[PDB]
Swiss-Prot record, chain D:
The lineage of its organism: Bacteria, Pseudomonadati, Pseudomonadota, Gammaproteobacteria, Enterobacterales. The chain holds residues 420 to 502 of 753 of the full protein. Belongs to the catalase family. HPII subfamily. Induction: By entry into stationary phase. Residues 40-74 are annotated as: Disordered. Disulfide bonds: none annotated. This is Catalase HPII. It is found in: Cytoplasm. Homotetramer. Decomposes hydrogen peroxide into water and oxygen; serves to protect cells from the toxic effects of hydrogen peroxide.
Length: 726, 726, 308, 83, 84
C-alpha cells in the first residue's frame, strides 16, 4: 500500500466545488450519471483496482522497475519483450492533431426538445419532447496546436454530436454567426495565413502577425468575422458563457416534403461573458488550461453547462427577401428580422474518463446529417462536406473511424462495406454486395417516409453553367461589419478599437497596417480614425469622405449582436477570491460565505503561504492557494474581510492582487480595516461605484457585491484604469 | 432481387461433405460450435437479416443504386455524402500484407493436454488435462503474396495462438524442423534472395530462380532446409497432412525453477502426405486456392484437422552432448536420439466469419510466451523476438493491435499503457504510471511463483565479450542434409533429385548451377551425380573424391524424417472422383458410395456437362463438375462404374482424366465395361498393382481401392509413367 | 501586383538587429551562408517568384478563388479536381508530434575541432582541425506539445546532428547533466507522470501537478534532476545561454582499439543565464514563442549561437 | 492517401511532373520539397502574390472547365436513356 | 544512492540561487492538491538538506518531525562539499 491510511488520495464520488477535491475520470466522480451513449461505452471501459499488471497479451509482470540485462550492470537483452512492448506502445502514443481546432475540451450530456417539431421537420430527435438524445460536445479554439493556450483571442468552435435513433447528427459550429471566407476553395489560404508563419512557425495561438492581416487587407469578405474576433467575443470568459452558431443556412424537411431554410443557434443559459484583453493574454501564461479546467470543474460541481438550441426559420419563398444572400456565410441574419425560435435544451453533465480516447479521437463532421435535415448551396458548407471525411483517414488511421468507441452510433448500422485498417466489426453476412440473392438482399434499402425512412435529398432546382465564379450577390463586404459595430455599447466599441490597435502594432510591415486602416474607413470613420491614431496614421481626404455602407434591411443596429447591451448575467458557478490575514474577523467570513453559498458562487481562500490561519474566534481556516499562486485573473471578484490587516497591508502580492483585479474591471469588496486598501487602487474617501465597502460584511454588503457580479464587470471604471501602474 | 422460393441459396447449418452446399461463415454454418474465444468475439459480430442498409453513421439509405446528380444526366454533386462514405471506405480497404507468409489460411479450434506437465513446466495451459484452451491457427506458404497460389514448392508456416488463462502464447512454427539460416541478421538477405527479383518482381511463389540459388550456393548453412524444400515435403497434399515444428530450442521452466530444453512438434493425425511436382505445379493453375479450400471444406464436413503436440526434451546438463549445437536452427534433433513425448491434442473445428477481420489481421509472434516457458540464445530466435512486434506497427496501423478482436486475450489485461492510433480501451484508472499512490498502485506487479505468478526470466549464466561472431559450433553444413537424404525411401530420393534438377534448369547463369552441384557433392555423391547428369554437368575427379560428412551421432538414417517409410495412412476426409456415364449401373454406384461412406471418404460425381444424368434404375444423379472443371489433380483416386461406357469411352477429357491420375500415381478403380479404359493407360490383361478391376464394384473391389488409398500413392508405378504422354 | 511600390515587403539579405526587418526563410535572408549540408539541400528547395500557380500535377490554375459549381449560386461539383487536391493536401498536413520534446526550435551551422583527437578517437569528424562538419541543432522543452510555450519550467533538450564523412552522429543531450531515472523500462511511467494527466489532459508545459510529485516522492532517484529543474536551470533566458550534456558515459575508441570513457558537454560562449520564475511564467502568456523568436532573431542579426 | 502514405505522393520520383509545379500547399507526411516562399497563402503581398494564377488561353494558359449547361433537380436517379 | 548528488548541487549554488530553488519547490508543491504528497516530498528534502527542507516546509505550513530534524546528511562526493 502506497495510498495514505486516511483515504485522502481518493476524490469524493459526489458533487464538490472547484478546488475542494482532486479532479477525477467522470465514471469514478459521478458513477450515478448515465445516458444511452455512456451506457454503450461500458464494454470498452477498463478498471484497474485489484488487478494484476500485465503485458497487453495478458502476461503478468513481476518486475516493472528494470530491463532484462546480462548482469545487474550489464547490457540490456533483445529478448526483453516486456520492455520492448511497453516502450513500443509509448513510442507510438501520438496521432496527428486536428488540422484546425486542435485545442478543445469536451463533455458528455443530453438534449431534449421542448415540443415536437414534426410540422417543420421529420428529424426523429426533434419529434417528441420525451425523446432524450445523448450528446458529446467539444469546444475548441481554431489556430493553436493541441498544447496551445485556452484564453487566446480567436474564434471558438462548438461542436455537438447527437447520437439519434436515426443516425449521428453532428452540428459543427463556432461562437460567431459568420465565417471569414465565402468559398471552401480558399480555406487553405485563409488557414495558412492565420496559422504560424511557415519559415519559423511563429506565432502560436495568435492572429497578431503579418500574414493574417495581409490576407484580411486583400480579402474584405473577411472583415465581418474579423470585427467579431477583435471584439471581446474573441476572448470568452468560459465555454459556458459564449453563443454558438451553425453559421450556414441548412434545410429542415418535413414529412410532406416541404423545405424550410434554417440557421442554428445555441443560447448560453449562464449568459454571455468575456474577459478583457490584458487579462486574457496574461491568463495564457498563468493558466493556459483555464477554459478546459473551468468546464471540467463546473461539471464536477454540478454547475452543468446548459444551452438552448434555437432555429431562425425562413420560408423557401423568402430566399430573396433580404439585402444579403442567405447562402453567404459572411452574412448574419439579424434577430430583429428573423427571430430565434426556441427548440430544446442541452445539458452537459459528465466529464470523459480518458481525454485521449474520448476527446482527442472524437470525429465531428457537418455532413453527418439525418432524415429531416438537408444542405444548401452555401459554397463554404459545400466544400466542408468533402473535408471532414477526408481528414479522418490520416488523423484516425483509416476508414473505420466510426468504430472508435466515442464515434459509434447508438442506433443500428449495417451495410456492405468491409475491411480497412483496424477493422473491429466481424460481418457474418454471406453477401458483401447488393443487389444479392444469397442473403435475400439484406440489409435492404428503405424508402423515404415520415419516420424511420431512408435519406433522400430535397429535389432543389439547379440551373446554370459549370463555372468557377463567385455569386455577385456575395460581393458586398462592409454593411454587416457596420451593423455589428453600431450594435456594440460604447465600451465594447472601445475594446474593438483597442483590439485592432494592439494587433496592427504587431504587424511588422507598416503598409499592411495602412491597408487595414483603409478597409476600416469603408466600415465606419470613427472606428477608423481611432485605430489610425493609435498607429500614428493620418487618414487622407479621400478616406475621410468614403460613404458608409447602407444599413441592413433598414436596421441601424441590432442589440442581440452585443455581449452586454441587454444584461443576461448569472452568478452561479462564478468564483470569488477571499484574501485572508493571520487573524480574520470570523463574522465577516461567515456572512461572506453564507451569502456566496446561497447564490452558488464559489470561493477560494488565499494567503501568503499554504497551510492554515486561525480566525479571531479560533476557527481554523484552510488556505487554497497563495496570492501569486491563484491570481485575480482566475476569479470574478475579490473580497477582503477585516481582522489583522497590518498582516497583509504592505504585502506586495496582496496589494497587486487588488490592482490587477481593479484594472480588469472586477467587483472588489472591502470590510472594516480592509478599507485601508483603498489607497492602493486610489479610491476616494467617499468611494466609487464598483468598490463595495462597509464597517462589516452584512446584509447589505453582500447583496451589493452579488449585484455587481450579476453585471459581470464595472464598465464605468474604464477611464480610471489608465492611472494605475498594473 | 431476391432469394429463390426453395431456400436453396442458404447452406444447411449441419456438417456436409465438400460440394454438397455452398460454403459459409463459421458462425452460420456451425452455430453450436463454441469455445471461450469464439464466444468473446460476439461483441463485434454483426448480422444483417432484416436490418436496414445504412451509412456507417447509422443513416438509412433509400437508393443505393445511384449518385446524387443535378438532373439524371447531370454531374455528381460534392454533397453526396453517402456515395463518398461508401467509396472512401472501399478506397481504403487494403492493409500491407505480411512481409513473409502473406499467403495463409486459418481456423478456430481448441487444445488440451493428455496429462498435467507440472513436473517440467508451470505453464497453466499444460497443467490440467480437462482445462481446454481455445486456439486460432494460421497455415501459410512463405514467399508469395496474399493472392499467390497454395500448392507451390515452398516451406509452410504453422502458427498457433493459444488463448491461455495466463496470457496469449503464440507457437509460430514451420512444417520442417530447421530453417535455412543461422542468425537473424541475415534474414533480410535470405528473404530478398528467395522473393521475386527486384528489377522485375518475378517469380511469384517460386524459389526456382537465380538469386535464390546464388544465395544457397554461397551460404552452405542453407543446404539442410533446401533438402527438405526439394523433397516432396515442399508440396504438401493438405495443411492437415504435414508436420509442424517450432524449430528452435526453447525452455520449459517448472515450479522449482528447473529449466528443461524443449523442441516443439505437431504430429498430423490424418498422416503425412504430399503431392508430386507435376501435379502440384499444374494445380496452382487449376485451383490456386486448393489448400485454403480443402481446409475450409474439411472443417465444414466434420473432418476436423487434428494434431498432436509433442515435445523433445533435453536436460540442461545435456546441452553439449550431441555433435551439433542445440541452439543452431539449421540442425534437427533426430527422434532416434531424443524421442517426441506426446503432450496433447489440438482440434480445429470452426471456420472464421470474415477472412479479413480474423485471418488477415491476426498477429502471431514467438516472443508471446507465458510463465513456464522461456527462450534460449538461438541467434535466429533472438532476432525474431525484435521483428514480430516491430512489423505489426505498420501492418496493423499501430501499437493497439492486441485490441483487434482476433488478437485479444480472453484473460485479464491491465497496465499503464495509453493512447496510440485507434485506441479502443477507455481506461478509468486515475493513474497512468507506477509507482502511484493515487490509485493505491493498481494494477500491481505480481511475484513469480508456481501458478498465477509474474513472468521472470530463467537466470541463465552469460559470459563472453561483445562480439559479432558466429559460434564455431554452427560451422558444419553437410552432415544433416546427408542424414536427411539417407533417411528417404528410393522414390523420395528420386523426387529430391528431380526437384533439384528442375529447379537448377531454371537458373539462367550456368556457374550458379555448377556451384550448387559442388555443394551437393559434399553431401552425397549419388545425389550429386544424378542432379549433374540431368544438367549435362560432369563431376571432376576432385568432386568425386570429396569425403562424405560424418554420421549424426552414429546415425546412418532416421526413418521419422521420411514422409512415407513408416505407414501412417488415414483415408477419412480424402476424396474420390466418380466418372459418370448417361446410364450408370446403379448397383455399382450403390456399393462404391456405401464403402466410401463407411471410411469417411468423400466423392464428386463428374460428367461431360452439368445438370443431371439418370441411372439404370431411375436414380437422378446431380453432376458436381465436368471432367475438365474438376481435374484428377483435385482428388486422391478415381473410380469408373459400369453402365453405358460407350457414352464416355472416346471422350478426350474422360480419357485424359485417367492419364493424369495414372501419371500422378493415384489409385484407379474400373468396374465392368469401365475396364475398356485399361487401354488408355497401357495396362496388361493380367492387371497391375494400383489398378483395381472386377466385373462389378463389390465388397472386395472397394476394400482393395480403400487399401491403396490408405497408402496414398502407387510408388511402384513410377517406372511405368515416363512412357505415357500426359 | 500586390507588393508595395517601395519594396518594403521584402527584408534585406544582410544581418539586421531584432525588429529591424520582417524575418525570412534562411536561404533568402542569408543566401551566401553555405555549408556542405545546406548546399546538398538545393535539389529539394523550391522557389516561387515568377512561377505560375499549379496543381501538384503541374496543371496551371486559372481561378484560385472559386470552386466549380453548377451556376454561380449552385452546388459544388465532384469533378472539381483542383479544389479536391488543394483541400486533400490541407486535410493531411499534420503528422504525429514527437512523444517527448515536441516543442523545439532548430538552426543550421557547422562544427570544427581545435586539434586532432586521433590519440583518443578515430572518429573522422574529430581527426583534423581543418575538418568542418555541418550540423543541424534542435533545442527543445520536454513535456509540452508542439504548440506549447517556450519559457516553461522544464528540462531542455539540446540535440545535434553532425553530418560526418563517415556517417551521421547524433549527440542527443539535455541542458542538465543527469536524468530523472535510472532504467529505460521506467521512462513511460516517468513521462506519463510528468505529462498532462490522463482524465482531463491538464496541465500543459507544467510539472506542477499531483502525478509528477507523486512519482518523485515514490522514486528518490529523481531528486537530483528535480533539484536542477527547481533551480533557475529550469527557466533559461535563451537556448544560447544554457549548457548541454550528453548525460551518459559513452566510449571513445582509437585506432589501437583502446577505449576511453567520455561524457559530452556543450559550454555556451554567450555564458549561462536564466529568467526568474514570475518573469518566465508571465512570459509564457506575453510571448509563448520567446525562445524560438530569440534564437531565429540572434541568427538573423549575426549573434550566432556558439558552443564549445 | 493510404496506399502511398499521404498527400505528397506526387513527390515519389516516378509520379513527379517533368514540368514546373509551384503552389501554396505545404507539409503532409514524407514532405520532400522545401518551399522558400515567404507566403503560403494567396492572395499575398509579401511575395508579390507569386506563384500567380494564369488566365486560360491558346497555349500555356490556366485550366478552365468548359461551361456546360446543367439543368435539373438534385436526384439520385439513373437516366432512362441508360435503361 | 539518491541524496548525495542533490546535496552537492544544493551546496554549490549561491545564496540567491538557493532562495530560488526553495521558491520553486514551494510554488510547485502548493499546486499539489493531495497534501500527503507535499509532505512526502518534504520528507525527501529532509534527506538532502535540513535548511532546504525547513524553508520549503515553512512555506507549505508543514512542521518537520524530530525524526526529520535528525536525518544524517548524505556524504560528500569524493571529498567534495561543492563544485562552483
Ligand atoms: C474545407 C475545409 C473546411 C472549411 C471551409 C471549414 N472547416 Fe471546420 N474543420 C475542417 C475543415 C473545414 C476539418 C479539417 O475537417 C476539421 C479538422 C480535423 C477534423 O476532424 O475536422 C475541422 C474542424 C472543425 C471543428 C472542431 C471539431 C472538433 O471538435 O473535432 C469545428 C467546431 C469546426 N471545424 C467548425 C467550422 C465552422 C463553423 C466552419 C464555417 C462555417 C468551418 N469549420 C469551415
Ligand atoms: C527477424 C526476422 C525473422 C526471422 C529470422 C523469422 N521470421 Fe517469421 N516472420 C517475421 C520475421 C522473421 C515477420 C516479419 O515478423 C512476420 C511477417 C508479418 C508478421 O506478422 O510476422 C513473420 C511471419 C511468420 C509466420 C506467419 C504467421 C502468420 O500466419 O501470421 C510464420 C509461421 C513464421 N514467421 C515462422 C518463422 C519460423 C518457424 C522461423 C525460423 C525458424 C521464422 N519465422 C524466422
Amino acid at each position: 500500500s502506497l495510498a495514505p491510511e486516511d483515504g485522502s488520495h481518493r476524490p469524493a464520488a459526489e458533487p464538490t466545488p472547484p478546488g475542494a477535491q482532486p479532479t477525477a475520470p467522470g465514471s469514478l466522480k459521478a458513477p450515478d450519471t448515465r445516458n444511452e451513449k455512456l451506457n454503450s461505452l461500458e464494454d470498452v471501459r477498463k478498471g484497474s483496482e485489484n488487478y494484476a499488471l500485465t503485458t497487453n497479451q495478458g502476461v503478468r509482470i513481476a518486475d516493472d522497475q528494470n530491463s532484462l540485462r546480462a548482469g545487474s550492470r550489464g547490457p540490456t537483452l533483445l529478448e526483453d519483450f516486456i520492455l520492448r512492448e511497453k516502450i513500443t506502445h509509448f513510442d507510438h502514443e501520438r496521432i496527428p492533431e486536428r488540422i484546425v481546432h486542435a485545442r478543445g475540451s469536451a463533455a458528455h450530456g443530453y438534449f431534449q426538445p421542448y415540443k415536437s417539431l414534426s410540422d417543420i421537420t421529420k428529424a426523429d430527435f426533434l419529434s417528441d419532447p420525451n425523446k432524450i438524445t445523448p450528446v458529446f460536445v467539444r469546444f475548441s479554439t481554431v489556430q493553436g496546436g493541441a498544447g496551445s493556450a485556452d484564453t487566446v483571442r480567436d474564434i471558438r468552435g462548438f461542436a455537438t454530436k447527437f447520437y439519434t435513433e436515426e443516425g449521428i447528427f453532428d452540428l459543427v459550429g463556432n461562437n460567431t454567426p459568420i465565417f471569414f471566407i465565402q468559398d471552401a476553395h480558399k480555406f487553405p489560404d485563409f488557414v495558412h495565413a492565420v496559422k504560424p508563419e511557415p519559415h519559423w512557425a511563429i506565432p502560436q495561438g495568435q492572429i497578431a502577425h503579418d500574414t493574417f492581416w495581409d490576407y484580411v487587407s486583400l480579402q474584405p469578405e473577411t472583415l465581418h468575422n474579423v470585427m467579431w474576433a477583435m471584439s471581446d467575443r474573441g476572448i470568452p470568459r468560459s465555454y459556458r458563457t459564449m453563443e454558438g452558431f451553425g453559421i450556414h443556412t441548412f434545410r429542415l424537411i418535413n414529412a410532406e416534403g416541404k423545405a424550410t431554410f434554417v440557421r442554428f443557434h445555441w443560447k448560453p443559459l449562464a449568459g454571455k461573458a468575456s474577459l478583457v484583453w490584458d487579462e486574457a493574454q496574461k491568463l495564457t501564461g498563468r493558466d493556459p488550461d483555464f477554459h478546459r479546467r473551468e468546464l471540467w470543474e463546473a461539471i464536477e460541481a454540478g454547475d452543468f453547462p446548459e444551452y438552448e438550441l434555437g432555429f431562425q426559420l425562413i420560408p423557401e419563398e423568402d430566399e430573396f427577401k433580404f439585402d444579403f444572400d442567405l447562402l453567404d456565410p459572411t452574412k448574419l441574419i439579424p434577430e430583429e428580422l428573423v427571430p430565434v425560435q426556441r427548440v430544446g435544451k442541452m445539458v452537459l453533465n459528465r466529464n470523459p474518463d480518458n481525454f485521449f480516447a474520448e476527446n482527442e479521437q472524437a470525429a465531428f463532421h457537418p455532413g453527418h446529417i439525418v432524415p429531416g435535415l438537408d444542405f444548401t448551396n452555401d459554397p463554404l458548407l459545400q466544400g466542408r462536406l468533402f473535408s471532414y471525411t477526408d481528414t479522418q483517414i490520416s488523423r484516425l488511421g483509416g476508414p473505420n473511424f466510426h468504430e472508435i468507441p466515442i464515434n459509434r452510433p447508438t442506433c443500428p448500422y449495417h451495410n456492405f462495406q468491409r475491411d480497412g485498417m483496424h477493422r473491429m466489426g466481424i460481418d457474418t453476412n454471406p453477401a458483401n454486395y447488393e443487389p444479392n440473392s444469397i442473403n435475400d438482399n439484406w440489409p435492404r434499402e428503405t424508402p423515404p417516409g415520415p419516420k424511420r425512412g431512408g435519406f433522400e435529398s430535397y429535389q432543389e432546382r439547379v440551373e446554370g453553367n459549370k463555372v468557377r465564379e463567385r455569386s455577385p450577390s456575395f460581393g458586398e463586404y462592409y454593411s454587416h461589419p457596420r451593423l455589428f459595430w453600431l450594435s456594440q455599447t460604447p465600451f465594447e466599441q472601445r475594446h474593438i478599437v483597442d483590439g485592432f490597435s494592439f494587433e496592427l502594432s504587431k504587424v511588422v510591415r507598416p503598409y499592411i497596417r495602412e491597408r487595414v486602416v483603409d478597409q476600416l474607413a469603408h466600415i465606419d470613420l470613427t472606428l477608423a480614425q481611432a485605430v489610425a491614431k493609435n498607429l500614428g496614421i493620418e487618414l487622407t481626404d479621400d478616406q475621410l469622405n468614403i460613404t458608409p455602407p447602407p444599413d441592413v434591411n433598414g436596421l441601424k443596429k441590432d442589440p442581440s449582436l452585443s455581449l452586454y447591451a441587454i444584461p443576461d448575467g448569472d452568478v452561479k458557478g462564478r468564483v470569488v477570491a477571499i484574501l485572508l490575514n493571520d487573524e480574520v474577523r470570523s463574522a465577516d467570513l461567515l456572512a461572506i460565505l453564507k451569502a456566496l453559498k446561497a447564490k452558488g458562487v464559489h470561493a477560494k481562500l488565499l494567503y501568503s503561504r499554504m497551510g492554515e490561519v486561525t480566525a479571531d474566534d479560533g476557527t481554523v481556516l484552510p488556505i487554497a492557494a497563495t496570492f501569486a499562486g491563484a491570481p485575480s485573473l482566475t476569479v470574478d471578484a475579490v473580497i477582503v474581510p477585516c481582522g489583522n490587516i497590518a498582516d497583509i497591508a504592505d504585502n506586495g502580492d496582496a496589494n497587486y492582487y487588488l490592482m490587477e483585479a481593479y484594472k480588469h474591471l472586477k467587483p472588489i469588496a472591502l470590510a472594516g480595516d480592509a478599507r485601508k486598501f483603498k489607497a492602493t487602487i486610489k479610491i476616494a474617501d467617499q468611494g466609487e461605484e464598483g468598490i463595495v465597502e462597509a464597517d462589516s460584511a452584512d446584509g447589505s454588503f453582500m447583496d451589493e457585491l452579488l449585484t455587481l457580479m450579476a453585471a459581470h464587470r464595472v464598465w464605468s471604471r474604464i477611464p480610471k484604469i489608465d492611472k494605475i501602474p498594473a
